[PDB]
Design a protein around this ligand. Structure first.
Ligand SMILES: Nc1nc2c(ncn2[C@@H]2O[C@H](COP(=O)(O)OP(=O)(O)NP(=O)(O)O)[C@@H](O)[C@H]2O)c(=O)[nH]1
Ligand code: MET
Ligand SMILES: [Mg+2]
Ligand SMILES: [Mg+2]
Lengths: 414, 254
RNA sequence: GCGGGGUGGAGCAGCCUGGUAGCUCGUCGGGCUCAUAACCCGAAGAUCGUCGGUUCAAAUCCGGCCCCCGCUACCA
């Protein structure tokens, strides 16, 4: 029987509306990423979800149907137990435009990407540009392109869109991102899809040397309605680890965490605690290694953490130090066109006192600029962001008709 | 039901009665005073009226005639004034709430009414006030009030219980915490609070403390005594407060 | 936790304290006025969500159930 190994790789599942995204993660895992009632009741992706699975290959059978993700080989007709490789998970993003910023969080976490295109929508849909440039600003050039729902669209139209998207590949960072045809519901060609994730998207070389940082994405009060005071568990903060690792009873701080009132003005309080639990899905590990969202509950009160309060915050070692600056400088190079836009106008350069949106790792902010230079800016924020490295990948947007569409790429010089 | 200490009502004293029947030359009324005595209200002593001489109305009547030889009485509904009926109806309301508490406790403890009102009404009558007060003070300073009057502890706690074999009463408490062991410390304020209530406020049945929001919680006081509910509710939320307000935990009730 | 609303064209009364299904805007007819609005009078309209128990006898005491629901959230 098959070992119990935490995921060592994340993959971004991004794409536009109705493309077959959540159904793709169902095709790979067997489970969906709609977890808040509104997500089902509206039938569209609003927030980022989670899903997990393994990978085993039958050394005897041919490719690729034997590439099944359970301790079995029966789909290729073999009796042998396949060779295990890993446990693989994903970041299921939205397609909507008022909801784009969210997936940007996940863009800083994924170690891969499977990007979908609609055979059954007019191509290129506007927001597809915004996903592609999201991957390009964050810089995960490792991409597997797929055309979806092929059961209603004929094989010639599939070929025409395949030529369109083979073209979409050439001329950019993605000259050789491949196209492997699958359908997310009927479980077709998903074996070749797993083979594609494997071959073309390998987990990076890990750096277990830098200060272990945990990038918050979600959090919950697991204390159920009716929880009496005897069995009170701490509030879980879930994310993914990128550099370092976490252990049982590690002394940490949540940064920034809470707001408190300080010195006649506003400020934040660094949230100190001891690590009490670290979960990967439905398996209990005592250590957390990089690759895949890692949920850590601690000795913190879940009132501070329930309902995605701290969204995107960072957490580091309680003997660490990170620059927390209320007003941050940015080297920003502006996009050449507005990518998710139905009609791509020009970029109107950013003038003083304007309002702009930032996503730093997973944390988000609104800000107004105070000193406008051509490439360098110093922007005053409504909350200081935690900049754990030099020139971190922030993603920046200006508001268009009520939809904050991106305007450039920025670097915080600390 | 009301059981008193004497046979026939006083001479000239005013009281209340429940009109049982009416015949052509008088009426049968039932005085709730001495086990429900049957008095003959004559039409010479009476006086819209269809509502005061009803089938089962409680009226305020005054006793004029008494006969200890045969043991009969003659009362009057008219010979009440307005400056008597007020205080007499007020005492009647006290005695009716007392009927409530004692009949409900004797219906719980499978006891009867006779011995009941011999132990409550008249062993507490040495204490000034209508016995409604004789437990209204038993609930504020301590249960030893009923012990002081000389009654056995067979109405004391059980009649203390039933009034106003389990009862549901609760509240909602709002808690914030900032410590590094904030969860251990909220369990600490809880498991320093719910300690030694059962001795200051005596034997009850069940208490529980749980959550209804993320910072908005719920505490239980469910025992034989709702007439001890708030006493066992309020201060105990306080025994969280009093301990929260020394362990860096903000604790209050909604 | 499981519980509530079950009733004229409607809006809700109306329980425990059992024998008029109750009052109001509406509906058609008649009065008053030179004529219209307001005001007075008369009839028509659910016959209580439904089986069942209590009950001489039930919106009225409640249970079984059919419908509408209803205070409520991913539980690493
Ligand atoms: N036939 C077929 N239906 C599919 C497939 N994928 C999804 N669907 C169905 O088609 C509808 C739209 O697809 P959807 O699952 O929303 O894809 P999506 O890209 O995740 N949409 P979003 O991210 O906005 O929530 C849904 O009813 C879904 O069940 C597929 O591969 N084939
Ligand atoms: C959706 S949070 C991702 C991992 C977490 N342990 C779960 O369960
Ligand atoms: Mg989706
Ligand atoms: Mg008229």
């Amino acid at each position: 029987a098959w070992p119990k190994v935490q995921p060592e790789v994340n993959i971004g599942v991004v794409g536009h509306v109705d493309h077959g995204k959540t159904t793709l993660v169902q095709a790979i895992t067997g489970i969906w990423t709609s977890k808040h009632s509104e997500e089902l009741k509206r039938g569209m992706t609003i927030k980022l979800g989670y899903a997990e699975t393994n990978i085993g290959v039958c050394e005897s059978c041919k490719k690729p149907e034997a590439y099944v993700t359970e301790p079995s080989c029966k789909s290729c007709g073999s009796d042998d137990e396949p060779k295990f490789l890993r446990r693989i998970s994903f970041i299921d993003a939205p397609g909507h435009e008022v909801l784009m910023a969210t997936m940007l969080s996940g863009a800083a976490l994924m170690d891969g990407a499977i990007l979908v295109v609609a055979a059954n929508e007019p191509f290129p849909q506007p927001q597809t540009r915004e996903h592609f440039v999201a991957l390009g600003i964050i810089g995960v050039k490792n991409l597997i392109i797929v055309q979806n729902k092929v059961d209603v669209v004929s094989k010639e139209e599939a070929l025409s869109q395949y030529r369109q998207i083979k073209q979409f590949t050439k001329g950019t960072w993605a000259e050789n991102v491949p196209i492997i045809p699958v359908s997310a519901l009927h479980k077709i060609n998903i074996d070749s899809l797993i083979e594609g994730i494997e071959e073309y998207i390998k987990t990076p070389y890990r750096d277990l040397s830098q200060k272990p940082v945990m990038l918050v994405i979600r959090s919950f009060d697991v204390n159920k309605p009716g929880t009496q005071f005897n069995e009170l568990k701490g509030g879980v903060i879930g994310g993914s680890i990128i550099q370092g690792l976490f252990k049982v009873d590690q002394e940490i701080k949540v940064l920034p965490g809470l707001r408190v009132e300080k010195q006649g003005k506003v400020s934040y309080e660094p949230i100190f605690t001891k690590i009490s639990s670290i979960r990967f899905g439905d398996e209990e590990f005592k250590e957390a290694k990089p690759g895949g969202l890692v949920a850590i509950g601690t000795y913190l009160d879940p009132s501070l953490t329930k309902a995605d309060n701290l969204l995107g915050s960072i957490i580091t070692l309680a003997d660490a130090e990170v620059p927390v600056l209320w007003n941050i400088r940015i080297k920003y190079n502006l996009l050449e066109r507005v990518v998710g836009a139905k009609e791509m106008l020009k970029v109107d350069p950013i003038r003083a006192k304007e309002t702009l949106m930032l996503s730093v790792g997973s944390s988000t902010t609104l800000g107004i600029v105070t000193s406008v230079k051509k490439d360098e800016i110093e922007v005053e924020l409504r909350r200081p962001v935690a900049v754990w490295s030099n020139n971190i990948r922030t993603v920046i947007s200006r508001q268009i008709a009520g939809r904050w569409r991106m305007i450039g790429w920025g670097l915080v010089e600390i | 039901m009301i059981y008193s200490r004497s046979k026939l009502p006083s001479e000239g004293e005013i009281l209340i009665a429940t009109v049982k029947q009416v015949f052509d030359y008088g009426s049968y009324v039932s005085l709730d005073e001495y086990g429900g005595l049957q008095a003959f209200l004559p039409w010479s002593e009476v006086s819209n009226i269809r509502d005061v001489l009803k089938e089962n109305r409680k009226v305020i009547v005054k006793v004029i005639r008494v006969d200890r030889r045969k043991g009969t009485v003659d009362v009057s509904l008219k010979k009440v004034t307005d400056d008597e009926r007020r205080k007499k109806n007020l005492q009647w309301k006290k005695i009716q709430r007392l009927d409530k508490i004692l009949e409900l406790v004797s219906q719980k403890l499978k006891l009867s009414e006779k011995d009941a009102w011999e132990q409550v009404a008249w062993k507490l009558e040495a204490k000034y006030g209508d016995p409604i007060t004789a437990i209204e003070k038993a609930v504020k300073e301590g249960e030893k009030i009923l012990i002081d009057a000389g009654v056995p502890e067979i109405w004391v706690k059980p009649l203390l219980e039933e009034a106003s074999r389990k009862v549901k009463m609760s509240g909602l408490i709002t808690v914030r915490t900032n410590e590094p062991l904030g969860v251990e410390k909220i369990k600490e304020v809880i498991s320093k609070a719910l300690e030694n209530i059962e001795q200051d406020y005596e034997s009850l049945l069940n208490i529980k403390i749980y959550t209804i929001g993320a910072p908005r919680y719920r505490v239980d006081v469910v025992g034989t005594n709702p007439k001890e509910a708030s006493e066992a509710l309020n201060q105990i939320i306080s025994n969280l407060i009093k301990i929260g307000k020394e362990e860096n935990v903000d604790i209050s009730v909604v």
